Amino acid sequence: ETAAAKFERQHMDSSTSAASSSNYCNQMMKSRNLTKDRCKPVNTFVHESLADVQAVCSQKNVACKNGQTNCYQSYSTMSITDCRETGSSKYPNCAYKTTQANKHIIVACEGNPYVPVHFDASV
Numbered sequence: 001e002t003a004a005a006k007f008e009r010q011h012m013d014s015s016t017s018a019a020s021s022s023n024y025c026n027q028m029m030k031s032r033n034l035t036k037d038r039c040k041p042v043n044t045f046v047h048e049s050l051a052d053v054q055a056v057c058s059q060k061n062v063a064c065k066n067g068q069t070n071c072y073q074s075y076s077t078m079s080i081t082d083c084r085e086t087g088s089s090k091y092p093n094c095a096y097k098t099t100q101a102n103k104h105i106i107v108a109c110e111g112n113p114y115v116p117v118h119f120d121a122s123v
């Protein structure tokens with residue numbers, strides 16, 4: 001899987017404007033294969049068009065949590081869904097808490113075309 005493709009699979013959900021219900025994370029973590037060999041503990045889904053996320057690579061340049069400088073913060077807020085494993089979750093029965101919000105996203109960009117390869121965080 002290419003870096004750009006892995007990002008898309010793990011973070012893009014342009015089919016919905018926002019998480020429907022509390023079971024959104026349980027379904028999405030499963031269908032995007034994030035519960036295949038381990039319960040990925042934390043994951044953020046972005047509900048905006050691929051083009052709008054891609055555009056962030058031309059927005060505000062900031063440092064990445066790791067100190068690298070190829071991160072960008074979106075000018076505007078975006079619809080996101082935070083998925084976090086519950087204190088009780090255990091493989092293979094992965095359980096998640098869903099939290100919908102509108103925040104600015106921060107992504108790491110690379111290549112050419114210069115596209116998002118990692119979801120750094122949101123604010």
Ligand SMILES: *CC(=O)NCCNc1cccc2c(S(=O)(=O)O)cccc12
Nearest residue numbers: 006007010011064066108117118119120
């Ligand atoms: C959710 C997600 O963004 N998946 C893309 C694959 N994971 C990933 C890509 C690039 C960097 C990176 C880092 S790092 O700290 O910049 O090295 C850490 C964890 C995952 C990724």
